Design an enzyme around this catalytic site. Structure first.
Site, short mmCIF file in Angstrom:
data_model
loop_
_atom_site.label_atom_id
_atom_site.label_comp_id
_atom_site.label_asym_id
_atom_site.label_seq_id
_atom_site.Cartn_x
_atom_site.Cartn_y
_atom_site.Cartn_z
N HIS B 44 0.87 -1.21 0.00
CA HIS B 44 0.00 0.00 0.00
C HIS B 44 0.89 1.25 0.00
O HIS B 44 0.77 2.08 0.92
CB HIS B 44 -1.00 -0.08 1.17
N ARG B 69 7.06 -5.25 4.76
CA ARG B 69 5.73 -5.83 4.40
C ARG B 69 5.69 -5.91 2.87
O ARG B 69 5.58 -4.84 2.22
CB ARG B 69 4.55 -5.03 4.98
N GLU B 145 -5.50 -11.46 7.99
CA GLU B 145 -6.41 -10.35 7.61
C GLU B 145 -7.66 -10.84 6.87
O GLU B 145 -8.36 -9.98 6.28
CB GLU B 145 -5.60 -9.29 6.86
N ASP B 171 -8.19 -4.63 7.30
CA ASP B 171 -8.49 -5.66 6.27
C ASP B 171 -9.32 -6.79 6.91
O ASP B 171 -10.22 -7.31 6.22
CB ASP B 171 -7.23 -6.21 5.60
#
Ligand SMILES: [Mg+2]
Ligand SMILES: [Mg+2]
Ligand SMILES: [Mg+2]
EC number: 4.1.2.-
Lengths: 251, 251, 251, 251, 251, 251
Positions: B44, B69, B145, B171
């Site tokens: 993201h 991540r 998630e 999420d």
């Protein structure tokens, strides 16, 4: 229209962002906040020409005027930034009337200056009738950072092609033999800053100032500064992170 | 030594930075604050592999563990990040025991996994005695998630080569048909988060969690989470800038 | 051999490409067309040094001479471009004999100039016997863009180390108080361009010109211009796209 | 609003740009022409994720919808492009209903898909009311360029989360054992293209097509195609340059 | 502490790396070898400001002092490199006392020079008490590459703010009308190099020299040179590759 | 012509460079040495797609075949590298006949594979007659570096669209539970390497091998290996630098 010139023409000051971090994401996000301009620092940052170019696009999309504090008062450097859609120029360490004329010469087409013609991104913004209003689209501020600049303030302000001056307080403090602290209380530095503001207004020219805090910017706006920058993205990010760590570790 | 593994081996949790902005300057500055690790988000964010590589160098120099991540749980993507000196891996959307085995396989050399050998930057950090402690130098967390991941939590935790799990609450909220709010306290999501934490500790494995505020991180640390991230550089920078503008434009 | 110097030595002019877009793909494709050189514009473009370097490699592979129109007539900027395999230099806004001497000084090793020795990519092209023919491998043109340059044309042409001049018609039009149109019919501008060409040929030096269309370039080639550029990639791409949209929408 | 979805909701087709060259300048200039969208090709180009990110900003500023033809139908690749403000997705080589479900899953948040939440640039565009209209803001087209895709057209069209299909004629020609000519009119390929268009409209779904010329695009628009791309920037630039050289070297 | 200044303060010379290739990997690997500093060449290389910035981080992590040989003796260029954590500056083609004063002015804050205040990476290294020892953290060497520089050696050495001189032997050879060979045996060049060393030591200032081989560096260290660079990464890589090919093909 | 296929068609082996450092300068310099190909490593390096693209141009100009060792055997990754002018493909961790079919499918147009059509840089190299010889222009090697790959060697070799195999000895040693030493001579690994070579030649297919030294490469060439790589730029540069430092600091 230049949103900073729009602010001024409606008898109102401009609040500006200040970016020392490269990248388009934070540039756009800050541009969408209640800032009139966002200044990209190319002096005290790792931001080269390659990295400013897309940041100017991001700021414009966010709905703030792309400004640049350049590395140095170099004509050709400034011209290349204008042609990449930098619609404000803050030139550091302008100490004489000649250096201020050097700034002015770069911001205006002939006959008014010696700016080279190839306005890649400004022609896309303003269309085929850009030449007639080219000077109005750009804002030019000479930085006052030295005893020399402070002594030459009157002769700097008399140069036609600059909108006025932008005080660099830390450098001004340091050159006067004081601590290079942002938002200094040092009486001599405050006195000099106030003096520079009065001479600028007396000459019918704009005055701006670099601020490291919202509280200090509020005072400068109340003092009648036309262009107020608060605060560096790095300084705000560093302070917020320290505060988040403190809250997380129960400090 | 891995500073996050050092924290754990001294029976205490790790506080981590979280970066969605590219560039080395803010990465180093945040790394020098009281963070044990700094996670670079490649899911993201606008951060490609070209941009993460020097950010890992900056974090290490600042004196925090470079974590990533990743975009996705892809073996070869994770291996290339390890060989560029990412000493922690958080893999998103790990929903099954097989996907968790896919993660583990990439983090360990044969016989324990199938990690390809060419440790460019780890060999420079740990020297000639890297191979003997290679698995010890790396931290691996599978992200929970989804309802699938939550249902498969016990079989995910049973995989040997992962240190444990990292909850993505927004999420997890969204997949359960609730609002994807930062630091969500929807009773069903809190119940699931609590369940995942207890099963992780019951299995002798670590549990971590994403936080968007220092206050929320303090609660998660108090709830006994081993790895706590707070907060995204963009979110902290945006909030600080809004607050600076508010103070500047105040009466 | 320098393919532009080869054209001249066989009593024939050079047709050149002109690039304001960064990237290697279009540079190679245009280089493979019937162009003798391809000029990369570093003045009126977003192309920094990082982006020119691989474009010079792409042009050379395509089988055209890599030329550069620099940001400014700066000795050290030009030297760094030569050492990256720019085998032609067009320096903008050369207004005096001294500025033309400043250009010449950068293009030649001692005793002829003051060029610093470290020819990274030229030594790879021309081998160990590069020093003896270094000056012959490079082409240097001073740009005529001002009334000052036009008035000083004789004294500019008398400088030994430049091959001749390259007219910038839009800037020349603007400085003479006319419209900055490419391929202008303005009688005074046409007269000045013709005058500059005659003085160049009278001095036994080359004359080149910037063109915005194939038809105008054909006239300039017929007028006996040695170096003809047609047209900017952006201008050609913009015009072609407008025409494709018109055909698609039945306009 | 999504300007392509606006075109469709007013019962009329969309004309799109197609970019194989990296850089923001030509992206903005083409976006300002009478195109509804501009597609960035990440399959048959040197454009990595690092280079697409600022091109999406440039297209949006120009006033066209940023579209991306991805390298491959990969969920996580597509999600990262959406979060960088790609508001249209064309996935290549979608041959089955499952591959089309794989595409759909990435374009929609839960419950409708499994899209991961972190909408960095979409949240900046659409504000706090983004989640409520998130699916409406994005356009998703599965590419038909194989006999398998052509055979599975009905089952591909039955997938809910895709707006419809985008034909790749050259690749479709090649897979059917014909010459991969731009704007191919091989009777078998024309028959297949016509078949795909009728089944799409019969299913209440959109059909688009890649064109290499304005004339061909006009026919496809007249044939009732909802999304028409014309033409690749490289192809248009190469053709214009060839024509400019031809005119310049003409007798 | 500055590891080169530490070497000098313990009455011992510094051995330095020399990099003409961009990238952080080889910079770190060479920094971890028995080098006291690593110089990044920005004159005779494709390394722009964008590419030096992360290389300085890599060298510091490896445990050597980041040095830079700049493109030119430009105040503002040098200041920007200092603020990016270049802790050594080698300025090329310093021919006069005034040019050496121009160098000194950039390396020191007021009152000692005119260096602009914004020390982004040095403030992160040295903390809040950086100002008091700022000059001690930086090393400044003026390059002697010309007959002019050689003639003006006494007046160059008399400038307070430079630590001393760095001989460029190839450029010095060339300007004296000899072969520009690294590690030259040419009696006049050897005589001049020896002369420059003696005057530097007579003035109580440091002397350094560029070397192309380990054997030559050993002699220069034995001759009492304070700063010795050996050898360019490209030259070492090229020689090693030629030797590997020779061994592989049984040549 | 493909210079590696030219070597093979003249019944003789190919010597290849191996690059883990990004940048075009060393790529060109090594390409100009007596190498037939230069492999760019995208698995065990900091080289993303952005950085490989111009390195392929540099290698081609130097006069060696651009090869790429990819991150993973992914069809779409390999296709994008071919369209950027990678004329050799080495796919890591090919363990089965299906994975080898996955490789082959990407290297050939229909009917022979499913390669997507858009050959940007190959069409510029080979011209209008590219499609007729497209498969001939590309070299494809499946990597053998697992016990699974070694067990499946016969079924891997039976795949039509691969030219043969490329042994990774260090990874093969590691998977067999031995030390991952460069140029390993563990009897079991030597036995496996010898077995793979004989089966390859028995199947009428090429065999290649990774070497970390010129001496080892000479033996592998003498053992009848068709493609020999020696040595990694980083390893050669690191060894040369260590040797230069040793000679400089020697008594
Ligand atoms: Mg300042
Ligand atoms: Mg011009
Ligand atoms: Mg030199």
């Amino acid at each position: 229209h230049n949103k900073v010139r729009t602010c001024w023409n409606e008898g109102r000051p401009a609040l500006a962002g200040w970016l020392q971090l490269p990248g388009t994401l934070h540039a756009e996000a800050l541009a969408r906040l209640d800032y009139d301009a966002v200044v990209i620092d190319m002096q005290h940052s790792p931001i080269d020409f390659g990295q400013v170019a897309p940041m100017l696009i991001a700021i414009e999309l966010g709905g703030a005027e792309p400004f640049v504090r350049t590395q140095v008062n170099d004509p050709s450097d400034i011209m290349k930034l204008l042609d990449a859609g930098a619609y404000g120029i803050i030139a550091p360490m302008v100490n004489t009337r000649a250096e201020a004329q050097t700034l002015a010469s770069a911001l205006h087409y002939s006959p008014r200056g010696l700016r080279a013609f190839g306005p890649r991104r400004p022609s896309l913004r303003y269309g085929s009738g850009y030449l007639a209003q080219a000077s109005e689209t750009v804002v030019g501020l000479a930085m006052i950072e030295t005893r020399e600049a402070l002594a030459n303030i009157d002769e700097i302000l008399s140069v036609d092609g600059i909108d006025g001056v932008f005080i660099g307080p830390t450098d001004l403090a340091l050159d006067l033999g004081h601590a290079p602290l942002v938002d200094t209380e040092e009486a001599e530095v405050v006195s000099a800053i106030a003096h520079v503001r009065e001479r600028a207004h007396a000459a019918g020219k704009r005055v701006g100032i670099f601020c490291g805090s919202g509280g200090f910017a509020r005072v400068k706006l109340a003092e009648g500064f036309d262009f107020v920058t608060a605060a560096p993205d790095l300084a705000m990010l560093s302070a917020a992170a320290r505060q988040v760590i403190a809250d997380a570790r129960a400090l």
